[PDB]
Amino acid sequence: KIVNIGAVLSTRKHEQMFREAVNQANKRIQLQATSVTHKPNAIQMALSVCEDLISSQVYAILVSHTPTPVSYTAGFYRIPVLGLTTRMSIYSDKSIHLSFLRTVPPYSHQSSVWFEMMRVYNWNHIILLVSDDHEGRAAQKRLETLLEERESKYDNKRGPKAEKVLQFDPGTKNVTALLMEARELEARVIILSASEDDAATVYRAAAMLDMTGSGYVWLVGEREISGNALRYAPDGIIGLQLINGKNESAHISDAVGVVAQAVHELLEKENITDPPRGCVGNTNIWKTGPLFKRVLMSSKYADGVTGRVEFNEDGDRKFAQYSIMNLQNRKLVQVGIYNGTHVIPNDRKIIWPG
Amino acid sequence: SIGIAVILVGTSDEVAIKDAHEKDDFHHLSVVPRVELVAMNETDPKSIITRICDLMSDRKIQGVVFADDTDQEAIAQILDFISAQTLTPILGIHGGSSMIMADKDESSMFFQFGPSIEQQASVMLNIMEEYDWYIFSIVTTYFPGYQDFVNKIRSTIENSFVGWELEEVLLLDMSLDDGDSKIQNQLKKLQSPIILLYCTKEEATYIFEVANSVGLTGYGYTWIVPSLVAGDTDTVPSEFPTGLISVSYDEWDYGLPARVRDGIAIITTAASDMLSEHSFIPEPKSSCYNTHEKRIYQSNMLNRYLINVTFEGRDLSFSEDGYQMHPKLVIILLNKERKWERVGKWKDKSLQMKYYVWPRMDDHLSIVTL
Amino acid sequence: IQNQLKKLQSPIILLYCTKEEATYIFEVANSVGLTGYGYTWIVPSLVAG
Amino acid sequence: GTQERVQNSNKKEWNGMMGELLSGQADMIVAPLTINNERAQYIEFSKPFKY
Numbered sequence: 001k002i003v004n005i006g007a008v009l010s011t012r013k014h015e016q017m018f019r020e021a022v023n024q025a026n027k028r029i030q031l032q033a034t035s036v037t038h039k040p041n042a043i044q045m046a047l048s049v050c051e052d053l054i055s056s057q058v059y060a061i062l063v064s065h066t067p068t069p070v071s072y073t074a075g076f077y078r079i080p081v082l083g084l085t086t087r088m089s090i091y092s093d094k095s096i097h098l099s100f101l102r103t104v105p106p107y108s109h110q111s112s113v114w115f116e117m118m119r120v121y122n123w124n125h126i127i128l129l130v131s132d133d134h135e136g137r138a139a140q141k142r143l144e145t146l147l148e149e150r151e152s153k154y155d156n157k158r159g160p161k162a163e164k165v166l167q168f169d170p171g172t173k174n175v176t177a178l179l180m181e182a183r184e185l186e187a188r189v190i191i192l193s194a195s196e197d198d199a200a201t202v203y204r205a206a207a208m209l210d211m212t213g214s215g216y217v218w219l220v221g222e223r224e225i226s227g228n229a230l231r232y233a234p235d236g237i238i239g240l241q242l243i244n245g246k247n248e249s250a251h252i253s254d255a256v257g258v259v260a261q262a263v264h265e266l267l268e269k270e271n272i273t274d275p276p277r278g279c280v281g282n283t284n285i286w287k288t289g290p291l292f293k294r295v296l297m298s299s300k301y302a303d304g305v306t307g308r309v310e311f312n313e314d315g316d317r318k319f320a321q322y323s324i325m326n327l328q329n330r331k332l333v334q335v336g337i338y339n340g341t342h343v344i345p346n347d348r349k350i351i352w353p354g
Numbered sequence: 355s356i357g358i359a360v361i362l363v364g365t366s367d368e369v370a371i372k373d374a375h376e377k378d379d380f381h382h383l384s385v386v387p388r389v390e391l392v393a394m395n396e397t398d399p400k401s402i403i404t405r406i407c408d409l410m411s412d413r414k415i416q417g418v419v420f421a422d423d424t425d426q427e428a429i430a431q432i433l434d435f436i437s438a439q440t441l442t443p444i445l446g447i448h449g450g451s452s453m454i455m456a457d458k459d460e461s462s463m464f465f466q467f468g469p470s471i472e473q474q475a476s477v478m479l480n481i482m483e484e485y486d487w488y489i490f491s492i493v494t495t496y497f498p499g500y501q502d503f504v505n506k507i508r509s510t511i512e513n514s515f516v517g518w519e520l521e522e523v524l525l526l527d528m529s530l531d532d533g534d535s536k537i538q539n540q541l542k543k544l545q546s547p548i549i550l551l552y553c554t555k556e557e558a559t560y561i562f563e564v565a566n567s568v569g570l571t572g573y574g575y576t577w578i579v580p581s582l583v584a585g586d587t588d589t590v591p592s593e594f595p596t597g598l599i600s601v602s603y604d605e606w607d608y609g610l611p612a613r614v615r616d617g618i619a620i621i622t623t624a625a626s627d628m629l630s631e632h633s634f635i636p637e638p639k640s641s642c643y644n645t646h647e648k649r650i651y652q653s654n655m656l657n658r659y660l661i662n663v664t665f666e667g668r669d670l671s672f673s674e675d676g677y678q679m680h681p682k683l684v685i686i687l688l689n690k691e692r693k694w695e696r697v698g699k700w701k702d703k704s705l706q707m708k709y710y711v712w713p714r715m716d717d718h719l720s721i722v723t724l
Numbered sequence: 725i726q727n728q729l730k731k732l733q734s735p736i737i738l739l740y741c742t743k744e745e746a747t748y749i750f751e752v753a754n755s756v757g758l759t760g761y762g763y764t765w766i767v768p769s770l771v772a773g
Numbered sequence: 774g775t776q777e778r779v780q781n782s783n784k785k786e787w788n789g790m791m792g793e794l795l796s797g798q799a800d801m802i803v804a805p806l807t808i809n810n811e812r813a814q815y816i817e818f819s820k821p822f823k824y
C-alpha cells in the first residue's frame with residue numbers, strides 16, 4: 001500500500017519538483033508522482049482523467065491554469081483537492097464543490113486591504129460600483145458585511161458610511177447616466193472591481209465627462225489595474241497585486257508539504273480505508289473523503305518558500321501579502337503591506353490625482 | 355433537428371414504457387419526437403458522460419429528461435457542465451438530480467424541478483399568518499445560503515401592513531471544538547414561541563441535542579425547518595422532539611409516469627412555440643467531446659422561450675434562473691408515530707389544511723357564539 | 725427539571741435546596757441561562773450555614 | 774405623504790411630498806408639515822416652529 005498523487009494541467013515545468021519533494025519526505029509511507037497535460041474542448045478533459053488518476057486510488061489532485069471539472073469530478077467519490085493559480089470567487093461555495101481547497105486569496109477577500117487603507121486616514125465617505133456578476137456581487141456582499149463592525153460595542157465610537165451603490169451589466173453600452181447619478185453626490189472615494197475589459201470601457205467612457213479629475217480618490221482591485229487598463233486610464237489610482245502572483249513553482253512545494261504533514265496524524269484512527277481504485281464502476285463513497293479533506297484545515301508549518309501556509313474557514317489561503325501599487329505618468333511604484341496584519345510605510349513619492 | 359429522450363438510470367421504477375405516446379397532440383408542434391427511451395444500469399461519472407454523450411451523438415437528443423433514485427446531491431451539476439458547451443436543455447426530475455442547486459453558469463440551459471429557498475421560505479410566512487401567530491426569532495448556521503435567506507424575510511416582514519415583529523437574529527458557529535462554551539451560551543437567550551432554522555442534518559442533530567439542554571424543544575414552542583432536514587424521510591434521531599414542522603415534496607403527489615409525462619410535455623410544448631412562432635430549429639451537432647474541429651460553431655437562443663409555457667392547462671411556467679414558478683409543495687407534521695403525514699398543499703397563494711384549529715401534543719377552549 | 729422551570733418570569737425567585745442540590749439546579753439555570761442581571765435569588769441558611 | 778400599497782406589488786412606498794425627500798429628490802422640507810409617530814421613523818425633524 002503506497003500512496004499516490006497526480007497533477008492536472010500545464011505544469012510541465014514542475015514534473016521534477018514533486019518527485020524531489022517525495023524524496024524529501026522519508027528523510028525529513030511510500031509515495032510517488034504522476035501528471036497529465038490539459039487539452040482544449042474540456043468535455044473529454046473531464047473524462048480523460050479518471051481511468052488514469054482515480055484509477056490508481058489517488059489521495060489528492062493538483063491543478064493549474066478555469067479549473068476543469070476536477071472541481072466537480074473529484075467531488076464525486078469525495079476526493080479532496082488542493083488547487084492553485086485560479087482566482088474567480090465562484091469556488092468560494094461549500095456546496096458547489098465538495099472539497100475545493102484553494103491556496104491563494106480569492107479576488108473577493110481583497111476587501112480588507114481597502115477597509116485597512118481607509119481606516120487609517122479617518123475617511124468615512126464612499127461610493128461603490130459592481131457589474132452584474134457573481135464575483136463582485138460577493139465583493140459587494142463582503143464589503144457590506146464588514147462595515148457593520150466598528151460600531152459602539154468603545155463608549156460612543158463611530159464609523160464610516162456606505163453611500164448609494166450602483167449596478168450595471170458587463171457594459172457593452174455607455175455608462176454615463178448611471179455615473180451621471182453619482183457625480184453630484186458629496187463624496188469622492190470611488191471603488192470599482194469588475195475586470196480588465198470592464199475597467200477599460202468604464203475609464204474610456206468616464207474620461208469624457210470630467211468626473212475623473214482631482215479630489216477623486218480611487219482604490220481599485222487587481223484585474224482592473226492591468227491589461228487594457230494601461231491603454232486607457234488616467235493616473236492617480238491605487239492598484240493592488242499579490243507578492244507572488246502569476247508564477248510557476250513557488251507553491252507546489254507548499255502544496256505537497258501540507259499534504260505530507262498530516263499523514264502521521266491520519267494513521268491513528270483505525271479507519272484509514274482508502275478511496276476506491278478505478279473510476280469506472282463505483283457507487284459508494286470513500287467514508288473518509290470529506291474527513292481527509294477537513295483534517296487538512298489544521299496544517300501548520302511555516303517552512304514553505306513563501307512560508308506560513310494556513311487555510312481559512314473557507315479553506316483558502318489566509319494571512320497573505322500584497323503590493324500597494326500606484327500609477328504615475330507611466331511608472332508603477334510600490335509600498336509593502338500588512339507585515340501580515342498591520343500597515344507599514346515605505347519611502348516613495350505618493351501623488352494624488354491631478 | 356432535435357432529438358428527445360427519457361433516460362431512467364438504475365432504480366426500481368422501470369415504468370416509463372407504456373405511457374409516453376399519449377401526447378399525440380405534438381403534430382401541432384409540427385415536429386416528431388425521436389422518442390428513444392434507453393434505460394441504463396447503475397452509472398459512474400465516467401459511464402455517466404459515456405452514455406450521455408454516446409446517445410447525444412448517435413440518438414442525437416436535443417433535449418433530455420433525467421431521473422435517479424439516490425441521495426447524490428451533485429449529479430445535476432455534471433449535466434449543467436454538459437449542457438454548457440453542448441447547449442442542451444435538460445430537466446432533472448426525480449429526487450437527486452433535481453435537488454436544490456444555487457448558482458450555475460450563465461450560458462447553459464439546464465433547469466430542474468423543486469422549490470428554491472425563496473418559495474420554501476415564503477410558504478413558511480403564509481403558514482405562520484394563516485394560524486395567527488407572528489414571526490419570532492431566527493436561528494442559523496454558517497452553511498451557505500443564509501445571506502440569501504434572511505433577506506427574503508426582511509423584504510417581506512416589512513412590505514405588509516400586518517403587525518410583524520422580530521427577535522434576536524442569532525448566528526452560531528459549530529465546527530470549533532473549543533467553543534462548546536459559546537453555543538449553548540448563544541442559544542440560552544430566546545423566549546419566543548416560534549423559531550425557524552436553517553442548517554444541515556449533522557448540525558441539526560447537534561443543535562437539537564444541545565437545544566434540548568436549553569429549554570426550547572418540549573411543550574410550548576414549535577420549531578420549523580425548511581427542506582434540508584427533509585432528506586431521508588424516515589429518520590428520527592433521538593434528539594429530535596415531536597411537533598417539528600417542515601415543507602418539502604418527494605412523491606406523494608405525482609407519480610413518475612405523469613412526472614416524466616410532465617417533462618415530455620414541457621419539452622414538446624417548447625418545441626411547439628418557438629418552432630411555431632418561427633420555422634428555424636436547432637442543428638444536429640457532430641459530437642460533445644471529440645469534435646476536435648466542431649468546438650467552434652454558432653449558438654442559438656431557444657433558452658428564452660421556456661419561461662411562459664403550460665400544459666394546455668396548469669401553469670408550468672419557468673424562470674430565467676430556474677425552478678418551478680408556482681411550485682406544488684406540501685406541509686408535514688412530525689407525528690408521534692415517527693412518520694411524516696400530509697396536512698396541506700399550496701397552489702397560487704393558498705392554504706387548505708385538514709385541520710381548522712391546530713391540535714396539541716386545557717388552557718385552550720372552544721366557545722360558541724350566535 | 726431542565727425544562728420544568730423555564731416559564732419563570734418574575735424578577736425575584738426564592739428557593740429551598742441543599743449544597744449539591746443547589747449546584748445541580750444552578751448548572752441547570754445556566755444551561756437555560758436565566759440567572760443573568762436582574763434576577764436575584766434569595767436562599768436561607770441551609771445553603772449559607 | 775402616506776403609505777399606499779401600490780397595485781401589482783404589495784409593497785409600501787411613500788407618496789407625493791413626504792416621499793419626494795426619502796427618494797433622494799429633495800433636500801429639506803419646510804412646510805406646515807405635521808409630526809406623527811409614523812414619519813418620525815425614517816426622516817428627522819426640526820424642533821416645533823409653531824404650536
Ligand SMILES: *[C@@H]1O[C@H](CO)[C@@H](O)[C@H](O)[C@H]1NC(C)=O
Nearest residue numbers: 337338339340341342343344
Ligand atoms: C506588525 O506590526 C505591528 C505593529 O504594532 C507589530 O505587532 C509588529 O511589528 C508586526 N507583527 C505583528 C504580528 O503585528
